[PDB]
Amino acid sequence: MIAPMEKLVLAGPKGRAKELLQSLQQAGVVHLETLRPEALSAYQLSPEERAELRRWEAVSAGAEHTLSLLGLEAEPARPFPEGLEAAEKALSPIQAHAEGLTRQKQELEEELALAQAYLEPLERLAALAHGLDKSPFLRVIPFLLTEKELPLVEEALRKALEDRYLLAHEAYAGGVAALVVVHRKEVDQAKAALSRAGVAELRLPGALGELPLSEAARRLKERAEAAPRELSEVRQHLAKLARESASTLQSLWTRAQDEVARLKALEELASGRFGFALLGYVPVKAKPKVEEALARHKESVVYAFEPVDEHHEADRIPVVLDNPPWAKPFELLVSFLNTPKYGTFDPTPVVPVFFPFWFGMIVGDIGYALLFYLVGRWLSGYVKRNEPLVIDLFALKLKPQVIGKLVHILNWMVFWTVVWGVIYGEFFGTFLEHLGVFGTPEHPGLIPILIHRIDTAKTANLLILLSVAFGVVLVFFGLALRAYLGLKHRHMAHFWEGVGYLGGLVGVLALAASYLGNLQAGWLQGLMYLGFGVFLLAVLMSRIWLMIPEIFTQAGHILSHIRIYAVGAAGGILAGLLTDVGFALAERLGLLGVLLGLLVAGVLHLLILLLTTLGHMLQPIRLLWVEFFTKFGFYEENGRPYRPFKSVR
Amino acid sequence: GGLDRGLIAVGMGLAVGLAALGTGVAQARIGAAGVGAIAEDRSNFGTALIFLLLPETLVIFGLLIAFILNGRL
Amino acid sequence: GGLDRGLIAVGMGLAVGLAALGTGVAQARIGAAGVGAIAEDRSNFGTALIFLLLPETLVIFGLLIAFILNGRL
Amino acid sequence: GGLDRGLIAVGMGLAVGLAALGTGVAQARIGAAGVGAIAEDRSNFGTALIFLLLPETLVIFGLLIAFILNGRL
Amino acid sequence: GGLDRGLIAVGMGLAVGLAALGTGVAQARIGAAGVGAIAEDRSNFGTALIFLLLPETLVIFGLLIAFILNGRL
Amino acid sequence: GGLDRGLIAVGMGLAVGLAALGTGVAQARIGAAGVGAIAEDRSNFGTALIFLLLPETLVIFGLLIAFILNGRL
Amino acid sequence: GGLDRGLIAVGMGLAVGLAALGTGVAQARIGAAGVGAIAEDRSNFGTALIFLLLPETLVIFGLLIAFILNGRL
Amino acid sequence: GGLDRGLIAVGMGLAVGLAALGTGVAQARIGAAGVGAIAEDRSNFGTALIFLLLPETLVIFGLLIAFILNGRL
Amino acid sequence: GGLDRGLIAVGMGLAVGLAALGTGVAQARIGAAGVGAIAEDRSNFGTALIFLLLPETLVIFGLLIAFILNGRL
Amino acid sequence: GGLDRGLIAVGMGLAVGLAALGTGVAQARIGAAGVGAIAEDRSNFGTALIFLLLPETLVIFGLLIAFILNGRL
Amino acid sequence: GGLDRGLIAVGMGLAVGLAALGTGVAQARIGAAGVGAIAEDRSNFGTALIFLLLPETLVIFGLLIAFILNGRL
Amino acid sequence: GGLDRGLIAVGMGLAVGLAALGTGVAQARIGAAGVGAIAEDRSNFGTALIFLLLPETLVIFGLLIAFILNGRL
Amino acid sequence: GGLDRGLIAVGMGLAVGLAALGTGVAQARIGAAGVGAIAEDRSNFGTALIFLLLPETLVIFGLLIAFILNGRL
Amino acid sequence: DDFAYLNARVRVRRGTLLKESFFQEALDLSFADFLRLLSETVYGGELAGQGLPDVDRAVLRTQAKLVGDLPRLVTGEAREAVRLLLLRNDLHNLQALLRAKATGRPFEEVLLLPGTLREEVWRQAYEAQDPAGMAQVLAVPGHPLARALRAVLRETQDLARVEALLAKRFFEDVAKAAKGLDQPALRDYLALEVDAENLRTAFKLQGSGLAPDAFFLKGGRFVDRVRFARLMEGDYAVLDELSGTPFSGLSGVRDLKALERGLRCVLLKEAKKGVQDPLGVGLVLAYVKEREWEAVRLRLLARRAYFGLPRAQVEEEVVC
């Protein structure tokens, strides 16, 4: 059910308001509604309240920055109990050490990256320049080239006249070096002509360009030898800072998020000359916890609980779902879709009975059910450890609470997968060859197979009518709900649609039974004519025209239930084929070939299981998500989600 | 007997295959627009899933005709 | 019988399958434009549906000829 | 000879199916443009419907030849 | 004449279907471009409709051939 | 009479249908460019109409072959 | 004599092939959009995978008729 | 008469229809580019028109083969 | 013996070929969206590769029906 | 010459028909690109025609094999 | 009789041709996305080549059925 | 005279036709990108033209198979 | 001997034509991509040409099966 | 080339943009409070610190990161279609560079907008010995910027006169290239942009008395050679003659500041109408034009806050 809502209406003196919200948050179950549409004035922050909000906001931001810098996650903790000034001076030292050390870490490794790419190339061009690092008229900046670009640069560089050599050079193996000049005023022009043919200066930034070529070697050498010690010292100090700071810093972050949220919530009040008021919604089941939190205030400050409307403004009422504990884990399978409008039906009680059953009927194999149970036990380890599960390949992250819901669903699903596996007699398909536990009349084992499934020519009609009956049940349940909601909310168009389609479908279904070739007519003609007369009368009453084409969509949604036979028959028949191939290998290659036949049967069974289990799991849930939920208009209007004013905990 | 068993098996296969081909052709574009709408925001999940599964009725009418042919032996 | 009964089945398979293919081809683009209009605004749901359903005339004309052929069978 | 009656069913099942595929291909783009023009403004509804329904004449001609052939049974 | 009677029927069904498919292929793009010109300016209507009707000659030639081939009954 | 009169009719319908399909494919794009140019101004009407009518000869070659076959029949 | 075991084998082999073509045509565009959303944000992975698997029903409806026809060999 | 005469008629119709289809496929794009060039500048009329007629050799060769088969008939 | 041994091989080959055509059509766009994601960022490799392998189910279901028919033969 | 006199006429009309289709599909893109190039400037009119006329070789091989068949028969 | 040797040769040809068409359709888009990534950055060559060769497994599955089926000849 | 000589003629005509269609499909896109590059500069012409002529190997092989069949006839 | 020879010949003609159509569809996109990459930068000619030639392997596999079938003829 | 792939990425990005409420609040703030909002929203990823140049650099870097990769994510005919939307930054780079080179200013005098071309191209275009060598280093296989340049080089093989010619050639070529492909959403928008561009061109040339055929440009849809001539002369009733066309809201305009705002709101509306094309180019078009409207509105709001202007001076410019 959608849980019943009641309006908390409250008023009191403007001086108590900020404290009453603390009390009310500290047992938080109320959804605040902004009390603006009133003759009074909206509550607004003083410059002192604005300053408190600003300060706690800066604390929250600085704490999260410091946590994320130290590689910590800002998950909630017990709130830091001391004052705002205490929180500020607790945060300021640890953020200052953290920023200083990470900046030192970054700037150091950035200097190391620039150095490592140049140690030998720079030392080599400096040895080419070794006697001529400060030439009076040949102190040109360093130069380099590709091993094929070296002759091209040298063809122009021959113009630098000198007694030692021209600007033409190659001088190194890892990359050609041209860090020389013969007469620098012309040699800069020969370097620019080399640049026009394709060349670049070797004076790389950093230690390679901040000092002359006589000191660039020293700088690169001294940083390259030193960087690992001071890096390891900064890195172990950053590790120390995190294990000292973590607990207090996320305890501060929680306190700051809580305090900021109360200051933000405080503006949603109405206020007058001296008094204030608020409106909020409480689900009736929670009301005792509000009552004791308000009753603490010595005055018994003025409040009342008022019953909510559902005929008007139902689109403003907050929605939350109340489910029995056997149903509640399946809420996860509907909650992805829209929130339902207040006073509407919630289908979450329906999914726990049909979806696990249809999945069991679809797979129907003892061997696969055991494999599903084993993987469920493997996930059950994470919730036993109270440990979150991650698979970064999918960005998958989920908490032990979600793991608990999924393990519960899988355990309720494997029971139906075992029982249909007995009824079809399947274990990896055809392991009744290995021992005659199951038997047909042709091979009469210890127990009969109640429905052999694999004998399509004998069995298929039974399972098709079974699947069609299931579909008729769900679609007629859905159209009955459409009629009932339309009747109960006094929206007669939804009543005439619900009764209209349901009358039309018994007309069509009677016609199908008659034309299938049954053994009698009797009352079928009367039922057919009654069904089509009800459809026509409901069309006429509504003056609505979309029912004429849409009847075939409804017929499609009755008949589309064949998939619960089809995917299951295809899966069982393929598993039977692979198990028979397994015996054929172990027979043709004899006793030596049993290990080969078993290995290839096993790997192909696990291949097709891994490749198709997702599809087998998705088909039964479509039938709820579209063939059922569309009938009573689950997607037709969106509810306001309940989210209470609550501690960050 | 004769070739009639042959021909009705060809007819039912043709029907279900062509109906499966049309539904696949429809579903390609509809679900491409659907995944785009969900990628911009998750509030469109009802609308995308409804529209994607609407043209799945065509392959179901093909299955119905195939079953009628199989029963008309 | 033989060829008489057999050729009715391939006759009706063509009739249903090609009509399903045509309506599926129509519904692809019309429902893509529909999903685009719905994701841009929620007030066009009724018009996107009436346009998406108008090409259904094609498959019901195919099912009509198939059922006529089944009756003559 | 019963092959006559059998082969007439292939003739009309091919005729209606191709004509249905033809109008479905016609209707696809016109219906997409229609939905776009209706989303852009609601004043266009008559022009969109008359352009969307006008290519139905092709399956009307497909049914005309199919029932003319069915008259020769 | 029983093979003659059966086999001319598939010949005329083939002609109408393909001629319908051809004019449908034409009318798709012509109607799309027409609807865009109406949404730009409602004065374009006569020109858009004239161009959309123009490719009907194809299916009329298909029906003419089918009728002269039905004259061989 | 018999088989060859029956089978001439398949060749005749096939030729007309394929010619009609080809001129249909040609007219689709040509007339959509034509309507796009007419949306700009009324001066282009002659040139757009002449371009749309040029591919019509293709279905006339289809009808010529069809009439030759009919005269042979 | 006869050849109908041969001919029902053609029927079942055609039905699975066309159903595989139809799911393949759908899955192409659905997963092209899905890989685009996953590339822009990995949180989309579940949505993309759900939409990519929904078209696989088309093959299974082809396999159903293929296994029913195999049961008649 | 004889069954081989009917297969000559299928042969010639197939030749002419596929040649018309190919030339119509080429003329579609070549005529659309032509209309775009005239709409930009009437100077382009002469060149656009000659380009539009160059793919007609295809249907000429189709007619040649059909006429050779008709003469041999 | 009887001709069925021959005609089974047509159904067998037709099944695997169309399933290969279908998964190739799928894998085209899936792998094109994949390569573009890897050229952005190597972190997309695993999620692109599993999307490229998912449409292989189609050709496994082709080989399934081919080996069933081979065992029948 | 027996029933093969029929099948050689199918072989001819098929060989020329598909080769003529191959040249038209080839010329479709090249003719548009050529007309765009002329619309830019008249200097490349020679390269436009040379690229347009190179794929005319395909339909020539179609006539070459059809005339070889006609010499064999 | 002996037609079975002929039909199993059609089974071989049909299987490998359709599987070759399927991998060719895949490799078109894969190679085009690959060439763009290598023109952007020469280091992409390994990932582009892996994706281009992976869908060639489809023609291997085609050949597997053709060599199995040749063992029946 | 037996049917087989005419059926060899179908086999060789089908082979040339499909090879011509494939090389035409390739040459369409390759010639289009070629003419666009020629319109940007003349220096790329040589490498553009060898890319356009490269797919002729398809028809060379298709016509080779037609001549070995013609030699067997 | 007998009719099986001619039916082997269409089997091998079909094997090569479809594989030729497959490699041509493969090369269609890859050649435009290569021509664009060449026009951007001459250095990529090695990788561009390798990516265009890899799909020829599909015709090698077509020819392989055609020569196997010729060895059975 | 696949719009199913690209529009999936664009749909994700289109989910994360500034709401109208962000601007409606930001209008009232101090610069320090405006910088608070900017620092926490998606723009904050490029916020270096505090001050007007920091805010501008942040908006430029985030827009370049969030839009200027779209032509690189796709290839083939989709690259051709999307590239037509981003070209203005490459025109502004080229004509800034061309002026700097003609007046003899150093390359350090030009600041380059992030665009569709890599920055090494603009340096080599400055270094290049001749306008033909410059055009060749600018060229990539279908980009209309370099082909508009090589077209005007025929007409004059040298600098300075090209400044009168380049933009007029370029805006015609961009509209022609769009008509040259099968994307209706792009075609009719770029036609409307050429109408708007010549309409404001005649308005800013008003009173000069030049020859109208020198300044009118081809490829419009709603405005023409004679309306352009009249509007360039002393006539405003030509605005009031516009009916049915999106420009009909310019009726009663007699001011360039009013015209600039009128056209800017009309083109934003027409671009926003392209969301009806979920598997074509209209969707990426609307995304690009909303993101640039966001960036200019965000830049003007930062100016209002920093210099402390009256709100009544800005409320008219930010409304649509």
Q: Three-state SS for A312?
A: coil
Q: Is E36 on the interface with N (CB under 8 A)?
A: yes
Q: Do C17 and D20 form a contact (C-beta atoms < 8 A)?
A: no
Cα I33 to the center of its chain, rounded Å? 19
Q: Which of C16, C47, C54 is the closest to D38 by Cβ? A: C47
**What separation in angstroms does the CA of E39 have from each of A300, N53, N202?**
66, 45, 29
Q: Do A13 and A39 form a contact (C-beta atoms < 8 A)?
A: no
Do N295 and N315 reside in the same domain of the chain?
Answer: yes
Do N247 and N314 reside in the same domain of the chain?
Answer: no
Tokens of A397: 């992250």
Q: Do F13 and H10 form a contact (C-beta atoms < 8 A)?
A: no
J40 to chain H: which residues are within 8 Å by CB?
A: none
User: Does F18 sit within 8 Å of E14, measured CB to CB?
Assistant: no
- How far is Cα A521 from Cα M33, in angstroms, rounded to an integer? 68
Q: Three-state SS for N85?
A: coil
State the pairing for strand pair A303-307/A640-641: unpaired
Q: Is C60 on the interface with A (CB under 8 A)?
A: yes
Do N192 and N273 reside in the same domain of the chain?
Answer: yes
Q: Which of L1, L3, L73 is the closest to J72 by Cβ? A: L73
* G73 half-sphere exposure, CB direction, 13 A CA radius: 23
Tokens of N148: 């508009």
Residue type, L3: L
With CA atoms as reference, report the closest residue to A362 among A564, A221, A508, A539: A564
Q: Three-state SS for A397?
A: strand
Kind plus residue range of the DSSP H or E element containing K23: helix K4-40
Q: How far apart are the first and last CA of chain E?
A: 10
Residue type, D71: G
Backbone angles phi, psi at A396, to 5 degrees: -70, 125
Q: Is L56 exposed, middle or buried (0-12, 13-18, 19+ CB in 10 A)?
A: middle
Do N212 and N175 reside in the same domain of the chain?
Answer: no
- How far is Cα K47 from Cα K38, in angstroms, rounded to an integer? 10
With CA atoms as reference, report the closest residue to A635 among N39, C38, L44, N176: C38
Q: Three-state SS for F52?
A: helix
Q: How many of the other CB atoms lie within 10 Å of CB of N90?
A: 24
- How far is Cα D9 from Cα L10, in angstroms, rounded to an integer? 28
Token pair 């069809």 in the structure block, residue: F66
- How far is Cα C49 from Cα C53, in angstroms, rounded to an integer? 6
DSSP string, A295-307: HTSTT--SEEEEE
User: Does E16 sit within 8 Å of D17, measured CB to CB?
Assistant: no
Biggest CA-to-CA distance, chain E: 59
User: Does A552 sit within 8 Å of B46, measured CB to CB?
Assistant: no
Token pair 């990534």 in the structure block, residue: K37
**What separation in angstroms does the CA of A524 have from each of A209, A479, A513?**
98, 22, 8
D4: left (phi over 0), alpha (psi -120 to 50) or beta: alpha
Last residue in a domain, options N160, N181, N202: N181
In the A/G pair of chains, how many CB contacts fall below 8 A? 44
DSSP H helices, A158-212, are 184-196
Kindly tell me whether chain D and chain N come into contact, counting contact as 3+ Cβ pairs under 8 Å: yes
Query: With DSSP H G I counted as helix, E B as strand and the rest as coil, what are the percentages for chain G, rounded to 5?
Result: 90, 0, 10
Q: How many of the other CB atoms lie within 10 Å of CB of A397?
A: 12
Residue type, L50: I
With CA atoms as reference, report the closest residue to L5 among J61, J9, M18: J9
User: Does I12 sit within 8 Å of K65, measured CB to CB?
Assistant: yes
Task: Give the chain B residue nearest N6 (alpha carbons).
Answer: B36
DSSP string, A581-611: HHHHHHHHTGGGGHHHHHHHHHHHHHHHHHH
- How far is Cα G54 from Cα G27, in angstroms, rounded to an integer? 9
DSSP letter for A440, please. Answer: B
Do N227 and N194 reside in the same domain of the chain?
Answer: yes
Q: Do G27 and G57 form a contact (C-beta atoms < 8 A)?
A: no
DSSP string, C10-65: HHHHHHHHHHHHHHHHHHHHHHHHHHHHHHH-GGGHHHHHHHHHTTHHHHHHHHHH
Q: How many of the other CB atoms lie within 10 Å of CB of K46?
A: 8
DSSP H helices, A425-546, are 456-488, 492-515, 524-542
User: Does N76 sit within 8 Å of M40, measured CB to CB?
Assistant: no
Backbone angles phi, psi at A279, to 5 degrees: -125, 135
Backbone angles phi, psi at I66, to 5 degrees: -60, -50
Do N87 and N155 reside in the same domain of the chain?
Answer: yes
- How far is Cα G41 from Cα C38, in angstroms, rounded to an integer? 24
Tokens of B53: 């599964």
Do N3 and N81 reside in the same domain of the chain?
Answer: no
**What separation in angstroms does the CA of A108 have from each of A71, A216, A365?**
19, 17, 62
Torsion angle of C-alpha atoms N134, N136, N142, N144, degrees rounded to 10: 30
- How far is Cα M7 from Cα L3, in angstroms, rounded to an integer? 10
State the pairing for strand pair A318-319/A389-391: unpaired
Q: Three-state SS for A349?
A: coil
DSSP letter for A409, please. Answer: H
Do N40 and N131 reside in the same domain of the chain?
Answer: no
Q: What's the gap in Å between the CA of E37 and the closest CA on chain D? A: 10
Do N137 and N228 reside in the same domain of the chain?
Answer: no
Q: Is M28 on the interface with N (CB under 8 A)?
A: no
Sequence-ordered list of residues with C-beta below 8 angstroms from that of H41, at least 6 positions apart, any chain: J39
Kindly tell me whether chain I and chain K come into contact, counting contact as 3+ Cβ pairs under 8 Å: yes
Residue type, N310: P
- How far is Cα A205 from Cα A203, in angstroms, rounded to an integer? 7
- How far is Cα B6 from Cα B2, in angstroms, rounded to an integer? 8
With CA atoms as reference, report the closest residue to N280 among B45, C30, K25, B33: B33
Please give the tally of structural domains in chain N.
3
Q: Name the β-bridge partners of A280.
A: A8, A32
Residue type, N97: L
N105: containing domain: 76-181
- How far is Cα A257 from Cα A259, in angstroms, rounded to an integer? 6
Q: What is the CATH classification number for the domain harbouring N37?
A: 1.10.132.50
DSSP string, chain E: -HHHHHHHHHHHHHHHHHHHHHHHHHHHHHHHHHHHHHHH-GGGHHHHHHHHHGGGHHHHHHHHHHHHHHTT-
With CA atoms as reference, report the closest residue to A508 among A479, A532, A536: A532
Residue type, E34: G
N211: left (phi over 0), alpha (psi -120 to 50) or beta: beta
N279 to chain B: which residues are within 8 Å by CB?
A: 29, 32-33, 36
Biggest CA-to-CA distance, chain G: 64
Sequence-ordered list of residues with C-beta below 8 angstroms from that of A570, at least 6 positions apart, any chain: G60, G63, G64, G67
Last residue in a domain, options N139, N163, N181: N181
* Radius of gyration (C-alpha) of chain H in whole angstroms: 17
With CA atoms as reference, report the closest residue to A555 among A591, A619, A508: A508
Q: How far apart are the first and last CA of chain L?
A: 12
Token pair 């229809």 in the structure block, residue: H17
HEC string of L43-58 equals CCHHHHHHHHHHHHHH
Q: What is the CATH classification number for the domain harbouring N121?
A: 1.20.1690.10
Token pair 């069991």 in the structure block, residue: A360
DSSP string, M30-49: HHHHHHHHHHH-GGGHHHHH
Tokens of F1: 């009479």
Do N216 and N124 reside in the same domain of the chain?
Answer: no
Do N156 and N80 reside in the same domain of the chain?
Answer: yes
Chains in contact with L, where contact requires at least 3 CB pairs less than 8 Å apart: J, M, N
Residue type, K4: D
Q: Three-state SS for A145?
A: strand
Mutation for N interface: M30, M35, M38, M40, most N CBs within 10 A: M40
Tokens of I35: 């390569």
Do N169 and N85 reside in the same domain of the chain?
Answer: yes
User: Does L32 sit within 8 Å of J33, measured CB to CB?
Assistant: yes
State the pairing for strand pair A318-319/A447-448: unpaired
Q: CA angle, A53 as apex, A50 and A56 as ends, to 5°?
A: 150
* A552 half-sphere exposure, CB direction, 13 A CA radius: 19
Q: Name the β-bridge partners of A278.
A: A10
Q: CA angle, H32 as apex, H26 and H38 as ends, to 5°?
A: 130
Q: How many of the other CB atoms lie within 10 Å of CB of A517?
A: 8
